[PDB]
Symmetry: C2
């Protein structure tokens, strides 16, 4: 989508995975989906230099809206949970130098069961533009057919442009299209700033394995189309929570960088290990995700429970990631010919590799003839960055 | 097994999960199964007060032996990897105040492919007793029938007593009996200090889930036989490595305690997060595992992705463990009537509950009538200990 936006993969925070559809502010006023929660996440994104580090988009997901529409046919925030409404919430967020996402659904309802947008795209866009929204996540629950779905996504996309406001448009289109026929990715790219491809993420290594595995098994399909203004979305960063171990969290952050994926954390910024904050804010790592070139990485090699992934960067740099998939034993040793690495370009004649993760130790100079030996952790990843002599 | 040993569940360290069958001391001298490894683990068990904390058995698993037997028909250490042999290694360990485990296999071979003990039980026991072995793990690979397997386990047990030395006898008997018929647990209890019931553990929550689930799906069978001198073995502690998050590691430690399991660590004592150490050495928690009573705990309640486990202790105490099995969202609240707890005894009339894990906060006094409210982390467990007013 050529709205001149998402020129690099969007970074921000999205409530869904961690905060789900919680409507109880009796007994749990803390996880409750309410302004006080966004207002507090906003307040914090500033304090702990998430914003400094590049996360700009405070995103609301499903369950913000009241049971039904008002008198004019418009949506509204839930009266009791967003007493002040969105215009004001937006307002507040902006003031802290941030940007606001909201969520809606192509069909007759959101996935939560709340009002959908079928028949209302024109009006609904306007509302959003009106409130000062900066990003919209459109979901695909509850709709007739692929015909309709395909049209809603398009029609909504058009509408948002018509409102004349910059709004990052994040679509769940492709996901809903299987298994009814592969999606035309070039089509979607023309309408969406980014798109959800596979299942939902939850707090598990299983989840992560399977997203990686699927993105992996499907690369020709998707790796090529990705580029400035239109990214593949493998889903949120769950680093921070309860499900993944350290090496597994590095596996995520490393592979979301290789993937030129958007980076929306779903976690609780109010209680977060300080080493999860460390990872999630790694400059060099974020820079890889954010590489201005925008070419999406891919899986090079596979087998003996190891995976090799690599991504071309600007200035003849590359990122390489080695995952250990063996969930037993201790850290394993792995070696590749530095020549079979960055297409055979990076390290001809000479190479400068700094390991970025899990540590950031500079390894030396590597000859075109040289081999890279490295030790990987069970379920972890080694992420390296390569430079040239040139 | 009435050898007056394992009167509480054995604590030590076993190489297998973390170190597996690693024979390359060329390129990996550090994981290589070698005396230097045990020597060094021994060295460290003392330094970092693993021994202080209760872990006493330094255990060798598969792959310590030479390709075949010597001239007299005895086993022998691999010449190159155990230049000094076992008698000396044993010796060294004892001096540090520790006890030495070894591994052998009922059939024609070990699982690694190395020499089995079919036809050699009598001699082989003697060899072990000779070296100063304090524990034997007998495995069940490569043998004809249940007929034979059943006999080897018995015969070996007999033989070890005959040597006249104290040797903890750790059997893999029941495991090799399915799916060929349920095992007679009373029978096994007469010959083994403890026994492996389910599949092998690896570094994953999957593994942990599935052991828990299976032990749980099978309690009547096994829960009741366990007592002093004869324990159910759900396999090693993998806390310390790469696979499990914090809350998952607490789930293991808590649950292995409830399960009156032996505690054999398989991790690298040389590189270990210092908060994995904390947990692994939690006195209070260790206590529960070692409760002198020796009644094994069990799963009380189940569902809505929660689990309730409890164990009777001495002096009318009980441990309760609550597991949150839901791998999405945030921490959940759970409540039980304190009355429905320790069979209804514990907290009649009154109750003193201190949470042991994941923190060790004292909660108040609880009335017989009282409810326990608690909040569990996705994939975590809350471990509570309950005392009486009496």
């Amino acid at each position: 989508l050529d709205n001149g936006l998402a020129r690099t993969p969007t970074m921000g925070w999205l409530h869904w995975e961690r905060f789900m559809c919680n409507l109880d502010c009796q007994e749990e006023p803390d996880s409750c989906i309410s302004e006080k929660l966004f207002m507090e996440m906003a307040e914090l994104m500033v304090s702990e230099g998430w914003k400094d580090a590049g996360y700009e988009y405070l995103c609301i997901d499903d369950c913000w809206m009241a049971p039904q529409r008002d008198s004019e046919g418009r949506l509204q925030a839930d009266p009791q949970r967003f007493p002040h409404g969105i215009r004001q919430l937006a307002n507040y967020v902006h003031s802290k130098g941030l940007k606001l996402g909201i969520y809606a659904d192509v069909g007759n309802k959101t996935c939560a069961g709340f009002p959908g947008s079928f028949g209302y795209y024109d009006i609904d866009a306007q509302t959003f533009a009106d409130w000062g929204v900066d990003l919209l996540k459109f979901d695909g629950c509850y709709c007739d057919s692929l015909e309709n779905l395909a049209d809603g996504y398009k029609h909504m996309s058009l509408a948002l442009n018509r409102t004349g406001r910059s709004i990052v448009y994040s679509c769940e289109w492709p996901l809903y299209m299987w298994p009814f026929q592969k999606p035309n990715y070039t089509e979607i790219r023309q309408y969406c700033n980014h798109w959800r491809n596979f299942a939902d993420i939850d707090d598990s290594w299983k989840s992560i394995k399977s997203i990686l595995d699927w993105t992996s098994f499907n690369q020709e399909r998707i790796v090529d189309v990705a580029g400035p203004g239109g990214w593949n979305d493998p889903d949120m960063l769950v680093i921070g929570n309860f499900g993944l171990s350290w090496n597994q969290q590095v596996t995520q952050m490393a592979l979301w960088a290789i993937m030129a994926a958007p980076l929306f954390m779903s976690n609780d910024l109010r209680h977060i290990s300080p080493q999860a904050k460390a990872l999630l804010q790694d400059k060099d790592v974020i820079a890889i995700n954010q590489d201005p070139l925008g070419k999406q990485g891919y899986q090079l090699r596979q087998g003996d429970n190891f995976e090799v992934w690599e991504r071309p960067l600007s200035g003849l740099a590359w990122a390489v990631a080695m995952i250990n998939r063996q969930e037993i034993g201790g850290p394993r040793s792995y070696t590749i010919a530095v020549a079979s690495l960055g297409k055979g370009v990076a390290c001809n004649p000479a190479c400068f590799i700094t390991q970025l993760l899990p540590v950031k130790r500079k390894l030396g100079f590597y000859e075109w003839t040289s081999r890279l030996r490295s030790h990987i952790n069970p379920t972890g990843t080694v992420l390296l960055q390569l430079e040239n002599t040139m």
